Every structure is written in C-alpha cells, then in structure tokens.
Amino acid sequence: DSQVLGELGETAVKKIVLETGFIYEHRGRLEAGTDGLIELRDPKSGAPLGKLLAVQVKATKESQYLRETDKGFEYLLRPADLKLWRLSNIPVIIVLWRQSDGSAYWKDVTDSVRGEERRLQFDKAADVFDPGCADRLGALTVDRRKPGVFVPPLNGGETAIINLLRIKLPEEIFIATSPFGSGRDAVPELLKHSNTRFDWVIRKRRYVSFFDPREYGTKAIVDVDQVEAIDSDIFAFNDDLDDTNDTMDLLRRTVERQLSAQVSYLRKERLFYFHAVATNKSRSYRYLANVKETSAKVVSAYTNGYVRHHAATFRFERLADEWFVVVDPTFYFTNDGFRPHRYPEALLAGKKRLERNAAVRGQVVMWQHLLVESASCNDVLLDFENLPVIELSRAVPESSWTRTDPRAKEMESR
Amino acid sequence: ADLKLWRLSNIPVVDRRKPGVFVPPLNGGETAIINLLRIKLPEEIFIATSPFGSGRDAVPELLKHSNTRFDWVIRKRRYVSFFDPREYGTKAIVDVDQVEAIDSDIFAFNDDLDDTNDTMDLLRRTVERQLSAQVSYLRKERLFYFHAVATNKSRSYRYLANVKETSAKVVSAYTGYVRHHAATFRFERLADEWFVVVDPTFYFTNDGFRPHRYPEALLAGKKRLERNAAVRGQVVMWQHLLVESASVLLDFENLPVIELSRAVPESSWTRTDPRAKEMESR
Amino acid sequence: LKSRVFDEPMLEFGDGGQHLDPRQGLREYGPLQPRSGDVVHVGVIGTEDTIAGFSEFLAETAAGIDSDNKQLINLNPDFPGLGNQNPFRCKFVIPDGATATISRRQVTEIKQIGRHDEAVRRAVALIADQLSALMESSAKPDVIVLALPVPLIEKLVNAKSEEIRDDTLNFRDLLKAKTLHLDVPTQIVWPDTWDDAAKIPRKVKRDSNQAKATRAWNLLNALFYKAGKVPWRLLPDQAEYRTSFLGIGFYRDLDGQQLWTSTAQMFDERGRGLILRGARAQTETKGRHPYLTAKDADDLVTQSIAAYKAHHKHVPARVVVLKTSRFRPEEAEGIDSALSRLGIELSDLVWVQESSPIAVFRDGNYPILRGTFVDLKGKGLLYTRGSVPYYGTYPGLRVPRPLLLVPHENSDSALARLAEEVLALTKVNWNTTQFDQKLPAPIKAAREVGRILKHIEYGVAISPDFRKYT
Amino acid sequence: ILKSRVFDEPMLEFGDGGQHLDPRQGLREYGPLQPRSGDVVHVGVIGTEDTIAGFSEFLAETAAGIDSDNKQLINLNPDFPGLGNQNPFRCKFVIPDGATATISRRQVTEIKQIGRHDEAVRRAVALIADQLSALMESSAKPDVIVLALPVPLIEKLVNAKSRDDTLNFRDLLKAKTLHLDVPTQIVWPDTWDDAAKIPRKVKRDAKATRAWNLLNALFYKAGKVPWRLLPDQAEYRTSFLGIGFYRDLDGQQLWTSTAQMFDERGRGLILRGARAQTETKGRHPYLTAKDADDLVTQSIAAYKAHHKHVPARVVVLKTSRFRPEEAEGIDSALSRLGIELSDLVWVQESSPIAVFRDGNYPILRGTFVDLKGKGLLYTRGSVPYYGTYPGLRVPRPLLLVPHENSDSALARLAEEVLALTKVNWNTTQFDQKLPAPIKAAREVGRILKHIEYGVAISPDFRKYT
Ligand SMILES: [Cl-]
Ligand SMILES: [Cl-]
Ligand SMILES: [Cl-]
Ligand SMILES: [Cl-]
Ligand SMILES: [Cl-]
Ligand SMILES: [Cl-]
Ligand SMILES: [Cl-]
C-alpha cells in the first residue's frame, strides 16, 4: 500500500518536473514516497546540463497535514529519509502530494539534512509545486562539478553472488592405514593393478577416500584388515589439523576426477584448466548465465603462437561446520594446447590487464556451473549447492555513472 | 718380478669353488668413452646492460618486436649473448649504447661467479636453439628430448656408431603412452675449456604431446632394465646429434678414447658367471 | 550472509571541521593543529637542472594549479596554491644554502658502472654524503627532496613491462637504511613529473604525457607528513588517545642464517607511527612462517606501549593488534600478558588476510562499493578498494579484491566494528591524497620498514619515527 | 690427453700381519687384527619370546657353520666356516643369562593398533628404551643388544616403498637410547638381517652371507677391530675427518655442524660443532673460519684423548664445496697443532660425468680418470675378485675435487678414498660407494636431529650404528 501510493505521488511529481524543463531520475523508495534527482535539461537538444537538485516525494491519500487551514499548514520531517543525502552536498527539496485534492507543495530542506529543524512551515500560496517553479528550482541546483559534490549510492541496494559453493559430502568416509607413508610412494604399486583411480589421500601412513578401497585396485595400497567406514561428519568437522588438511586434499582430488571430462589439474601451478582435445584448435563450453544459455571459448587457439585455456584456483574452506569450494578464475597458456608455453607469465599479464568486472563475474558463474553440472547426469561422490545471493544495502549508481563518468567505457569487458 | 701375476690369486704354482681363489684378470688394457664433448666458443661474445633485472622481465618487451630469438641471458641487469643483439629484436631489451663485443675467453674463463653462471646459462640456451630441429627442452624436467612429430606415431633418428650407420626409435609409439629419448645436459669447465656432459634418460607422454599422468613411475620401469651397452649407445647417439648440429654458433669436438691399463675379463666371465645374462640390455 | 556498506570514514581537519576527503577537508578547514608561521624547510639534492626544475614546480604549486578536466573534479581537483587558500596553512620554502648539487660527472660515473649492485652502492654512498653535508648546520631541513636525473633513476631502478626480490639491490631500500641515522626523511621524485620514484618498478621508456594539480597535492602532502605535521585525525567521534593500533610483522635477513626479525608498527588516530624492532622469530617449517614466542611477543608489545608512553605521556586504554598471519597461541598469550600487566583491559587481535580468494560480485561493469562488508560466520569480507561514490567512479582498472578479517577469540569487539576501523585505517596516507587504499596503515608500514631494516644489522638501535622510513 | 689409472683393490692387514683384499677371506685365514685369549662379545636380546628364541637358534646355527648356495661365485657368496676351530673372528658370541627382555604380545598389539604413525613410533621407542634401560641395570652389562621385533611390528613402524614428514622409528630409537651407552642392532626375525635402515618392501619375499654380516656388525659394535687399512707408508698416522650438517625441525630450523673422525683401524669419533651459517634462504650450510677452527680443534682433542697421540696427517672430507672461511679455519687449527699434512677433498655423489667400456659388464671398480684437477673414481663397478658386477643398475662414479690447500696429488687421494669405502659396519661386501666418514655423516645427522642442541653426546660411533 505504501509502495503504490508512493508511485502515485512520484508520477504526479514526475509529470510536473518534465513540464518545468528538468529530467527526473528515480533513485529508490521511501516510507510513503520516493527518492529521486532533478537535472536541468537543454530545452532544444534535451541534453542534461549538469545542475542537480535532490527531490523526496511524500504522498498521502485524503489526509490532513498538521494544523492545516486554507492558508497554510505544517509538516514533520523524517530524519532517516533526509539522511540519504547527508554528505552529498546536493540541495534537497520535499514535495508533498495528496490524492484527494491533487495538491503539490514543496519546500527547501537542505538545512534539515544537516540539523534538527524538523518542523516545516508551509504557505499554500507561495509553496505551490507546479511548472511555474522553473526559476526557483533552477536557482537551487548545484553544479555536478562543484568540489565536494557527489551522487550517493542508491538506497534500495542490489544483489551479488559469492565465489563459494556448498559441498555436500557423502555420509560415509573410508579410514585405513597404509604400508606407504604418502600417496606419492603408493602410486607405482597402484599402477601394477587394474580397476585403478586416484581420488584418495595417503598421508602419514593413513588413507582416506569416499569410495571403498577394497572394491578397487586401491586394496593393494591399504591395510585391508584396517579398512573402516565412519561417519564423514566426524572426520571432516573436528579440530585435528591432520584430519582437516586431509579433507581439503581428498576434496580436491575427488573434484579432479569428477570434472575430468572437461578440466584437468596442474600439480605445480595448483590450477584446474579446461584441457584441449586437439592441437592448435579452439573449443567452447556452454553454460547457463541467469536464464539464458551462453558460450565461453574455454580453449582459444591463436594460429601460428599459443593456446589460451580458462583456468581457476580451487580453495576448500570450512565455514561453521560446512565445507565450501572457492573459485578464483584465471588463465593458463600452452604452446599448442598441450605443451606448456615457455613464457606464460607474459601472456597471463596480457589478458589479465584488460579483465573487468563483467568478465570476472561471468567466469565465476561458468566455473560454478561446471561444478554443479557434474553432480547430475553427465563416479559422482560430491554434490554442489549454490548459495543465496547477497543483499547489499546500497547499490552502485551505474545508470547515472554511465552518463556522467568519462571512464565508464574503461570499465567495460572487451 | 717373481710370481707377481699370482700375488692375490691364491692359486698354487685348487677348486675354483674354494673361497679365496681368484682367477687373475688377463693383463693388457681396453679403451672407453667419456660422456663429454669439448665446446668451441665463438671468437666474440656480446655483453651489455639492460633496463630489466632478469630475462623473465624482458620477454614482454621482446614479444612487442619482430626478428626475435631466445638464446640470450639477462641476469642482474646484465645481458650476454653470442649473437649481436643490435641486429635482432633483442635491441629492445638492451641498452644499445652499452653493447660491446669482447673476447669470449675473457667472459667464459675467469674467476667471477656471475660470469661463470651466465656462461653456463647462455651455453644451455644456445644449445637448445641449435638443437631445436630434433629435440625440445623441458623447463620443469630440465630435459632435452626428441619431440613427437605426429600424434601417436613413432620416428627414428639416423646416426653413426663406430663407422657403421645405425638408427634408434627416439620416439616410440605403442598405440597408453609414448616414450621419448631424453637426456640431461651439464656444462662443466675443466682447466680453460668448456664441455657439455650428456646423461641419457627417457620422457613419457600420453599421445606424443599430452603429458602423461605420473610418468615418474613409467620411468622406473624402463630404467630398471637398463644396462651398460644401452647407456653407452645412448651416449654415442646424443654425442652424434651435438657434433652433427654444427653442419649455428657452437661447435663440438669428440674427445680421444681413454686408455685403461686393465680390462674387464668379459669374454671369460660370459662362461663362468651365472649372472652374465643379467648384464645384457634386453 | 549478513552484509553492510560502511560509510566513508570521517576525518577531523581542524576547527572541528569534518570531511571524508583529505583534500577537500584541508581546502575547507586547513590542517588539524596549525601554528601561525608554520613553514616546512625543504632541502634539495640533485643536479643544477633538477634543482632549478624543482624550484620551478614549487613555484607553480604556490601559485595554484588548475585541474586538467573537472568532470571528475573530486578525483582530479585543482590545487588552490600556497597563498590565501593554502590547504596546509604552512609555507614550503627552500632555505638559502639548503641545496647540494650532484656533478654531471658523478651522474655519468654511476650510469656507466657495469654491475648493478656496485652502481647502487656508489649512488647510495654519494647521496648519503650530500645528505650529511646538508645537515652539518648548513641549514636545518625538515625534509630533503632527492631530484635525481631521469637517466640516473633509470640506471638505479629496474624496469618491468607495461603489463606487469633480492637478486638485485634495491636503491631506495638501501638508501633509506644507510641514511636512517641521519634524522631526515627523504623524498625521491622524478625530475620531469615530480611524483614518487624508485618505490615501484619503472617502465622501459618515460612517457612525455599530466595531472600537475594531483602531483602537487601528493608532493606537498608527503613533505607535510615527513616534516612531522598532522594533516587530520581519524575516528573523530571516538575519544582521541584511547585506542592505538599495533601492527606486528616480520622481515627476513639475507646474510647470516636468514633469521626472521619481529617488528612493531603502532599508529595513533593522528596517523603518526612508531617503529620498534623485537627479538628474532621462530619459524614453523624449513625457515618459513615466522612467529614469536609468548615471552618475545610480551616483550615486543611492552616495548611498544613504553614508546607510546614516552611520546604521548599516557598509556592507551585499548590496543588493536593487527597481523597478516594468524595469531599463534603463544602470540595471543604473550600479548595478553603484556597488556594485563600494564592495566590495558581492552584489546582486539585481528588477522588481516591480504590474499584471500573469496570475493563477491555485482551485476554490471562497475565493481563492488568500497566499504562493503560481508559477514562469513565470524570472518569479515571487507572491500577497502572498489567503487567510490565520492569520486563518482572506480579509480582503478583491474578489479578490486577484498580483505578477509579474522578476529581472535580473545577480542572484545564485534567483527563489524573492527572492520570499520580497518576501513578507517586505510585513510592514513603518506604517499598520495587519494583515500581509496587497500591496506590499513599498520600493515602497510610493516612491509615498508621490513625492506629497510633488513639492511641494518640486528642489535643496532633504530629510530622509532616512522616518517623517516617513508 | 686424460691420464688414467685402475687402482689395485686396496689391501687390508689382519692378524699376525696377514694381508688380503677381502675382509671375509682375510678373517678366515688370519683372524682379527688384535685378538686376545678369551675374546667374547656379549649379546643382549630384546623381542618377543618367539623372536628371542628364534635369534638364539640362528646364533647356534651360525656357530655350527653355514654353506654357500651359489659356489660358482664363491668369493661373492662364501660359506661361513662357523664359530669353532675355523672361527674367523677368533671370538665367542654369547647371550648371557638374564640378558634378554621380553615384549608381551599385548604390548605388541597395542602399538600395532595405534592410529597415528607418529604416536605408534614414539610409544614403541619409549617401550624399547625402557627394556633397554633394564637390561643395562642388570649386572650383565651386554656389549651389543639385538632388537628382534616381530614382523607385524616392524611392518607397522617402517614405511614401504616398493623424510621429515613422518617419524623414522630407527632414527628416534637411536637418539633416545644414545645415553644408555649400548649399541643396538635391529633385525628381521625370519632372515636375521638389518631392518628399519631402509624402506621395507610392501610384501616380504644367502644365509651364510647374512651370518657373516650379522657377526661383523656385532663385532664392530662391541668395539673390536677386524682389520686395518694398509697405509702407503709406515712413518705417520692419518686421520680422516668428515664434516657434515643436519637441520633442526623445531625452533628456527638452524643447521648444526658435525664431525666424523675415523682412524686407520676403522673407528670413528663423533663431535657436534657450532650452528652453521647458510647461503640463501636457510640452505647451503657452512661454517665460519672461527667455528671450523673450533670443530677441527675439538676433533683432534677427542682423537688425542682416545689415542694418546696426535695424527701427522688429517684428511677433511665434505659433500659440499669448501668455503674460503672453512678452508681458512681448518688451516688455522692444524697449524696451531703443528699438523703439517692435510687434504681437503670435496666428494660429489651426483655428478653426471661417466666413462663407458664396450660390453655388457660395467667399468672396473677402482677406475680413476684425471679430469684436469678433478678425480673421477669408480668405487662401484666390476669386481674381478667377485668374478662379476655385484649389482644390476649401471654404477656411477664419484667426482673428487681436492681444494687447492691440499698437499697430496690427485691420484693418491683417490686411492685413499677407494680404501675408505671398505671400512664397513653393515655388510661384508667391500664394494661400497661412499667412504666411511661421509657415510657416517648421513647416519649421524639423522640421529642427532632428535637430540636437543647443546646436549652432550657420546663420541663413540659404534653407538650410532
Ligand atoms: Cl568435452
Ligand atoms: Cl630467457
Ligand atoms: Cl638463475
Ligand atoms: Cl665530480
Ligand atoms: Cl694404473
Ligand atoms: Cl706409527
Ligand atoms: Cl653407483
């Protein structure tokens, strides 16, 4: 009810503002009205001029203001509403609108933005808000290029996505001792058998995996009589440094196998990267950004030369008895799609220099899509869960900035 | 003098299976080959300062220009190369008014640590380019290896052993891995001469180009069965590749065979040793 | 996940004047505590050209410099000059006989040395002598500007490509260490643009371009800070001299056994820093992950509070300790022992992660607002860099990456209060007048003094004045 | 023009001036160097009732003699002639009464069931250190104590492979029992050969050779001298001083210098010096001239206290190059002591330089090649006295780089290094790769890293073996 009524008052005020020779820009909502900006308009070209006046509309249906007669009335100001302009150094006017009579009254309230003058005095004769106020409002505007003046962020806020995906572990994890001290020592024994797989950890003679080691070739590298299935809640959520470190290690190797159709792992660089399928040939990955499908050239060959692969760093972090995977996008460069380039650092700095927000955000969405997608039907031990969006209390005025910031193009992802 | 030949023999002058008796090895010597090749440096070497501290920092500026090459060294703001940097794209990564052609022996044969290390570094990068037709260089593995030419396809290198022509499957295809003849190169200074040392090994990929997963374990399988005649042959082959390449800034000379005063009684041991078959390369 | 967008931290500028922007606040109110007749005496070392060039730029600075483009007037302000609208309310004067000239031959001699380490050592020895001669009662300079010729700086400073250690000596780091016993702060400037030099890698070629007004702001603010004057004060609402912020860091020696040494960087709300050197550190693995024992952490905190008491004559009521590595149980124990002994009942231990991969992303081309704070179940994601409403843009090009703040369980304060203070501590600036800096001052000073103290032998007493390390 | 040499297999002196190249054949013919009437080595045993009785039966079968199972290579696989009239050690090997400690089968299963490897090792060490202590309190006072842990317990404590991350059972056992002042010998209970020294096989697969090696090791640990190196002259004594380093795990991970001082009778003295400096980022340990002076001075003093004479020649062996400070400090100590003969030899184990003969058998052991100031020495290779190459993988030579302060010529030093490879406390096969002082540096460093710096340590090397 408050919302609709506010859009009614804003629409009435917006209609007058356009007749008066100004541009109206909506900014946010208020208790009973709206928050907006007024800008002077070139009468012929319609172009913005750069002179600003903040406007707050308060609307009411058929209600009488304080101590109202036929000659004037009084009004009590809302400090939280005026506080959105506390440091902007932009002048503010309030415009009171009523649905019964259709009356619009306005008053300059900059002095109440920085003080405690809450009692307003209105004179229905001189305080009328209508197209005849062009000269009065124009004299109240401030230049956008006056030192200390800035447009504040939007009070309605916006959403944002995090680079964290919740991991859902299986209920059981397999404990064992091993003849080998580390997995590095156990691999040559494992390769001597068949039915092999590498999503397991052996550190300090202890073995961990989400699959049963006795049902695969891993039986040759474990003490079979000491294999034991425990509740994965106890292993993955305790205070023991050895256990949390081995959980992070097992989570990574499990992820490595689960995503092996699309990406491979680089041990030295600690990087997951979309591998090539043919030398000197590009390929794309199809994922869902928002409600629309989109393609990213995860392997991009530049014919002779080098081949650029979409890469990412995975960190597994525990937050309040839950495990999460963090995705940090980057790139990896080969000479032909497989052979590593002998000077990759130079190429990474080249692509990273031009990276902007939209591109980085899109890579996070794509990598998070690849993680969640591998749990459904593409052997699958980990499920991944998207987090709710973050509700930020203040939003970047991008729409305003794309007009006014001379560097708005430098922010675009080429 | 006297019965010197039978000094340690403990054979009267007994059963061979009596402890302590040892058939004296037939006197007279045999020859042998060292895994070393003398390196003849060019007359001149080019030194200069650089705005970049290291060669890694200089590469992005080098790529911005044309006529590039990578057989150069920049360390501690000092550039060295056997070619003139002013006549190639390396002009962008040197202070051109500091470029100075000096005698190679001054730089390569002195007591300075940085000069000796930069000489070793330049020799390795000059060799890598001079051998780029047949072998590539691995940065992590620090290996020179015969690169694969076609996916999952073998090839052979054609060299000379003794005075007889021979060949070897430097890239071997089994059509779940492929093994490449590899080697570690070491550059050692003996008196006032530089030598390259050749130490053969192998390198394992998947299809010829994709690195194999855990090739360390595939290596130990082939190294386990490697015996003298195999290692000696690989030394001879790599030594031929290096001498052949100067047919270019570096030349390589073969060293004389070493004359050993005593000889392994191999002919006798093949009959008497129950492990002689364990000594051959399968 | 709880999210807040903090207001830009307010600053007090004098006569009670309050503003979020250091530049605009100085223009409108002046500095915090000016005295009638304030003057910064500036010595100059350089060649005849660079000395005369610096005198020219100081004159245009005094006359006032207009902005190149007033579309982003807050990010690209005018400089109102050093007259009636002097934002520092202070004279900047080169006294008579306060200039030492470097001969044309001395410049060429260094440019021609083939080994970089020897060229740096020769340059440091040359400038240290000219510095010492200037301080032999010739004048009493409060700060000395080093205007080295462009080819000399290019000889001494390594180059990195436009896109983009200890293998080579760092001229700036060795110079600051070799001249620390002389009690002068120095300012190395490029003699063409008059901005900071030798602190970051240079480009292969110097651009001919301008933003002279901004460079004037940054130069005078650096000379102002180096002279010891306070431009403004942080946390205006909070009672002053109550809370102090004690950064604890480590640097690794190069010779000997490459032992680590603990350092302390304690700042007040007036932006003044005290630098103290503690005991050698333990290490967790193979000489890495430096840490302090409880006795050594106790000693370092106690030595710090004592230096705070010698300069401010009273003891702080709260001490916020900042580290870039997690607090060892020994460190938390030693800090508590030292503070309880001195009767300091309020303390917060904050682990500030510079390189956390966790990030949040808005929909659009502009990045997250600076001051955005996301509570990640006891871990604070804080955006000290990002979109700045006051500037009307995002002043960077590469995307920002947030800090991750992990307060110790021994802390008294809530996570959101500590994050807001960390945000405020990013405003203490000795190098620029642009307030959107990533690190809080105690952590920034740790890296800067570590690069200098590793050239001063362990055991040698060092000056506690941070302004002489900048 | 590369000068070449093939050294004779260095000769050893046995009892009554008897001479032979083979320690086994020499003891068979002449007996040990300095035998006495009634010579006995008292052997204590720690293990289970099964393994204690099993070891007592292997000692008895050893005393009765064991025959070779490959008489076509008789010198490499000799018989053991027994402990009777043909006793090569001319000494008795006897387990005294009450010199046995039993580990209960409940104590075995407790350690075998410990989850963490590091906790099972520390508990097993503390248990054996208790049994070790008790036997010593008993008036038996054995000379060497054999540790016969059952096969499942060794397999628990020893990693398989078909080092600082996990505790090493053997290293921590030697460190924690070093103060008890008795050498120990860990053995497998089925084959009675050395255990826990190297990684075991994941699945356990000549008896006379194992008898030879077991007795030679107990003989050495008891302190008796089997033979001595035959010096190339008869005027003065030479001492071989190995200088090494080991790194601490706690604290600041500082390095500590060690000294391994061996005489021509094969006996070593172990000293700890000052903390080492490092070159880059805590790596490449080295000593200052002052600390190298002190270390060599402390080693000479210990040698004098045990021998009542100062050697006329000191050979210093290192696995890393001699820093100028190290060479300066070594010269200062020796000159102060009036020692006028010295050699500083850098021994490189991993050089890629090699020499290749034409055939399937590798280069002869003892082959030396002068590489213009650097000595290529094949300490392993074809052994004529064995009639074969005792190995399978091709051998790789040592590279000897004498410092310029050395007094000897290159060829003479290489033959000396070849002879030092025969001082050997773990086997009776003489074709060892490393000379004894360098071999001791590795073993000694793995043990002392578990003993806090500044704690007095025993000087007798037999207690570290
Ligand atoms: Cl695919
Ligand atoms: Cl390079
Ligand atoms: Cl290097
Ligand atoms: Cl001059
Ligand atoms: Cl000879
Ligand atoms: Cl004598
Ligand atoms: Cl070998």
PDB file of N, CA and C in Angstrom, chain A residues 179-181 185 189 204-206 240 242-243, chain D residues 116-117 155-156 159-162 165 200 202:
ATOM      1  N   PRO A 179      50.635 -49.348   4.116  1.00  0.00           N
ATOM      2  CA  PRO A 179      52.078 -49.621   4.204  1.00  0.00           C
ATOM      3  C   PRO A 179      52.925 -48.443   3.760  1.00  0.00           C
ATOM      4  N   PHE A 180      52.397 -47.589   2.889  1.00  0.00           N
ATOM      5  CA  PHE A 180      53.139 -46.462   2.346  1.00  0.00           C
ATOM      6  C   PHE A 180      52.946 -45.223   3.211  1.00  0.00           C
ATOM      7  N   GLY A 181      53.988 -44.392   3.266  1.00  0.00           N
ATOM      8  CA  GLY A 181      53.907 -43.173   4.054  1.00  0.00           C
ATOM      9  C   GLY A 181      53.065 -42.099   3.391  1.00  0.00           C
ATOM     10  N   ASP A 185      54.366 -42.367  -2.713  1.00  0.00           N
ATOM     11  CA  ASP A 185      55.038 -43.658  -2.637  1.00  0.00           C
ATOM     12  C   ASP A 185      54.138 -44.809  -3.066  1.00  0.00           C
ATOM     13  N   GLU A 189      52.826 -48.862  -6.892  1.00  0.00           N
ATOM     14  CA  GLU A 189      52.143 -50.101  -6.539  1.00  0.00           C
ATOM     15  C   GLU A 189      50.734 -50.131  -7.114  1.00  0.00           C
ATOM     16  N   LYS A 204      51.026 -39.742   6.068  1.00  0.00           N
ATOM     17  CA  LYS A 204      51.442 -40.209   7.391  1.00  0.00           C
ATOM     18  C   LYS A 204      50.858 -41.590   7.695  1.00  0.00           C
ATOM     19  N   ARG A 205      50.952 -42.484   6.709  1.00  0.00           N
ATOM     20  CA  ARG A 205      50.513 -43.875   6.761  1.00  0.00           C
ATOM     21  C   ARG A 205      48.997 -44.035   6.822  1.00  0.00           C
ATOM     22  N   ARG A 206      48.225 -42.952   6.814  1.00  0.00           N
ATOM     23  CA  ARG A 206      46.772 -43.046   6.892  1.00  0.00           C
ATOM     24  C   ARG A 206      46.144 -42.779   5.530  1.00  0.00           C
ATOM     25  N   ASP A 240      41.226 -31.519  14.566  1.00  0.00           N
ATOM     26  CA  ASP A 240      42.522 -32.145  14.337  1.00  0.00           C
ATOM     27  C   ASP A 240      43.108 -31.642  13.022  1.00  0.00           C
ATOM     28  N   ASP A 242      45.531 -32.747  11.184  1.00  0.00           N
ATOM     29  CA  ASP A 242      45.760 -33.785  10.184  1.00  0.00           C
ATOM     30  C   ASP A 242      44.476 -34.128   9.438  1.00  0.00           C
ATOM     31  N   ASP A 243      43.341 -34.113  10.137  1.00  0.00           N
ATOM     32  CA  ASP A 243      42.085 -34.518   9.519  1.00  0.00           C
ATOM     33  C   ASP A 243      41.526 -33.438   8.600  1.00  0.00           C
TER      34      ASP A 243
ATOM     35  N   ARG D 116      47.649 -43.139  14.694  1.00  0.00           N
ATOM     36  CA  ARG D 116      48.628 -42.244  14.096  1.00  0.00           C
ATOM     37  C   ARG D 116      50.003 -42.901  14.074  1.00  0.00           C
ATOM     38  N   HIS D 117      50.693 -42.784  12.936  1.00  0.00           N
ATOM     39  CA  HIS D 117      52.009 -43.400  12.801  1.00  0.00           C
ATOM     40  C   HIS D 117      53.008 -42.795  13.779  1.00  0.00           C
ATOM     41  N   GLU D 155      56.652 -54.000  10.322  1.00  0.00           N
ATOM     42  CA  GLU D 155      55.845 -53.520   9.206  1.00  0.00           C
ATOM     43  C   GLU D 155      54.969 -52.344   9.615  1.00  0.00           C
ATOM     44  N   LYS D 156      54.595 -52.272  10.894  1.00  0.00           N
ATOM     45  CA  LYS D 156      53.862 -51.110  11.383  1.00  0.00           C
ATOM     46  C   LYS D 156      54.765 -49.886  11.473  1.00  0.00           C
ATOM     47  N   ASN D 159      58.050 -47.680   6.970  1.00  0.00           N
ATOM     48  CA  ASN D 159      57.309 -47.408   5.749  1.00  0.00           C
ATOM     49  C   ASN D 159      57.801 -48.294   4.610  1.00  0.00           C
ATOM     50  N   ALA D 160      56.911 -48.549   3.659  1.00  0.00           N
ATOM     51  CA  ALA D 160      57.229 -49.315   2.464  1.00  0.00           C
ATOM     52  C   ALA D 160      57.355 -48.389   1.261  1.00  0.00           C
ATOM     53  N   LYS D 161      58.093 -48.852   0.252  1.00  0.00           N
ATOM     54  CA  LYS D 161      58.311 -48.030  -0.933  1.00  0.00           C
ATOM     55  C   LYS D 161      58.433 -48.824  -2.226  1.00  0.00           C
ATOM     56  N   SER D 162      58.268 -50.144  -2.206  1.00  0.00           N
ATOM     57  CA  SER D 162      58.269 -50.969  -3.416  1.00  0.00           C
ATOM     58  C   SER D 162      59.526 -50.780  -4.265  1.00  0.00           C
ATOM     59  N   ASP D 165      58.516 -35.699   7.233  1.00  0.00           N
ATOM     60  CA  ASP D 165      57.067 -35.656   7.407  1.00  0.00           C
ATOM     61  C   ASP D 165      56.599 -36.688   8.425  1.00  0.00           C
ATOM     62  N   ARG D 200      61.127 -50.733   3.733  1.00  0.00           N
ATOM     63  CA  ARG D 200      60.858 -52.142   3.501  1.00  0.00           C
ATOM     64  C   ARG D 200      60.048 -52.330   2.221  1.00  0.00           C
ATOM     65  N   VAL D 202      56.688 -53.834   0.336  1.00  0.00           N
ATOM     66  CA  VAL D 202      55.292 -53.907   0.755  1.00  0.00           C
ATOM     67  C   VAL D 202      54.912 -55.344   1.103  1.00  0.00           C
TER      68      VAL D 202
END
